[PDB]
Design a protein around this ligand. Structure first.
Ligand SMILES: Cc1ccc(-c2nc(C)c(-c3ccn[nH]3)s2)cc1
Length: 214
């Protein structure tokens, strides 16, 4: 069975229920013991944490859930009443993420949406009563970063000050998304280097703050 399910089992077998930190450490510990790169890791975690704290978003959209590590990371730093929406293309991953959130005790703060972001995103306003997003974390298929950013604008889901945080923009790389947010006055960009201690390589995140229709 899948890596994500083995991650879930290890957490459920060892972590402390209702303790987000216990859950994150268990996930990290296991993924290192397995030498699986597919994890966000804790140094990227810090940069996510810093962004979540800085802009204290009331509504966050996450693209890609996987085993739910990033959902747990962000949801634990959401202020009372703030909410997270998470899109995930693989039903099992979505199921695992639900369970991961459950174990962390954070399920009340998150809504998991099943499907392709391209199909789900245009439904956010009508079907999920979204006005606009405060933050968007991009961590799904690298070839969807740019199309979904464009799609979010078209759907009027971004406002002035909406924070896009994009992970893995160097490794494996999203050069198209970078060229667009850095090249357009619609965004203000900050780059964050982040060493991957297992790939032995320098990855990065990009923070792009929407400026409005520009
Ligand atoms: C045309 C098209 C194809 C695929 C996607 C994807 N939407 C999401 C949430 C994906 C993902 C990656 C990891 N977990 N979930 S992939 C969107 C549009």
């Amino acid at each position: 069975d899948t890596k994500e399910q083995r991650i879930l089992r290890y957490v459920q077998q060892n972590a402390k229920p209702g303790d987000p930190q216990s859950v994150l450490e268990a996930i990290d510990t296991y993924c290192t013991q397995k030498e699986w790169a597919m994890n966000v890791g804790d140094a990227k975690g810090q940069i996510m944490d810093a962004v979540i704290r800085e802009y204290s978003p009331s509504l966050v959209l996450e693209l890609g859930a996987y085993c739910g590590y990033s959902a747990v990371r962000m949801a634990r730093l959401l202020q009372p009443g703030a909410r997270l929406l998470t899109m995930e293309i693989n039903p099992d991953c979505a199921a695992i993420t639900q369970q991961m959130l459950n174990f962390a005790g954070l399920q009340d703060k998150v809504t998991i949406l099943n499907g392709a972001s391209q199909d789900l995103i245009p439904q956010l306003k009508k079907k999920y009563d979204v006005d606009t997003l405060d933050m968007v974390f991009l961590d799904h298929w690298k070839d969807r970063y740019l199309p979904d950013t464009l799609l979010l604008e078209e759907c009027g889901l971004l406002r002035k000050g909406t924070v896009l945080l994009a992970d893995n923009v160097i490794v494996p790389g999203t050069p198209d998304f970078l060229a667009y947010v850095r090249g357009s006055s619609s965004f203000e960009c900050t780059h964050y280097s982040s060493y991957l201690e297992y790939m032995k390589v320098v990855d990065g995140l990009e923070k792009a703050i929407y400026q409005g229709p520009s």
